[PDB]
Design a protein around this ligand. Structure first.
Ligand SMILES: C[C@@H](Oc1ccccc1F)C(=O)O
Length: 165
């Protein structure tokens, strides 16, 4: 199970870790993917999770999109976790680099409330363009279930912990 996490609140924990390495180690029930509406797992967390599954996550995602169409920004879908987790909760946070409404980040985090425990990245942070300090604040103010946040960047992890209020 989860180890070496810093407790931020009653239900939010954080660690400086590669979410792929963390998923392979723990084999959580749910690993969250930082997805886009098309489930095109090209870069960031999505590209790294997909590569770890030997592209099985992308093949499965393309079948999902062919059947259901794209997700909504702020929405999610539950797919297989392949070799990384029981399930992968693909959550679409707003991409501010594409002019998506940052207010949709709270709706994106609300998807975590349907799962008792999750391994997750900070939504809309990194290549999605939003402020990670703001993403952590929305996470702790929205998620009520047990969330274990994996922050890849050490300098960001330190800044998130030192500025947490
Ligand atoms: C949210 C994401 O942020 C970064 C990733 C890579 C470089 C810089 C970052 F600020 C993370 O560390 O998990």
């Amino acid at each position: 199970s989860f180890s070496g996490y810093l407790k931020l609140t009653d239900n939010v924990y954080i660690k400086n870790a590669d979410i792929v390495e963390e998923a392979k180690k723990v084999k959580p029930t749910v690993v969250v993917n930082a997805a886009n509406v098309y489930l095109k797992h090209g870069g960031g967390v999505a590209g790294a999770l997909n590569k770890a599954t030997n592209n099985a996550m992308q093949v499965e995602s393309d079948d999902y999109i062919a059947t259901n169409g794209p997700l909504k920004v702020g929405g999610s879908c539950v797919l297989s976790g392949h070799n990384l987790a029981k399930h992968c909760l693909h959550v679409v946070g707003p991409n501010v680099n594409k002019g998506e409404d940052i207010q949709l980040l709270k709706s994106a985090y609300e998807n975590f409330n349907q799962h008792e425990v999750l391994l997750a990245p900070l939504l809309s942070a990194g290549i999605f363009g939003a402020d990670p300090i703001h993403s952590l604040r929305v996470c702790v103010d929205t998620v009520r279930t047990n969330v274990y946040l994996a922050v890849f960047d050490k300098n960001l992890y330190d800044k998130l912990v030192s500025s947490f209020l």
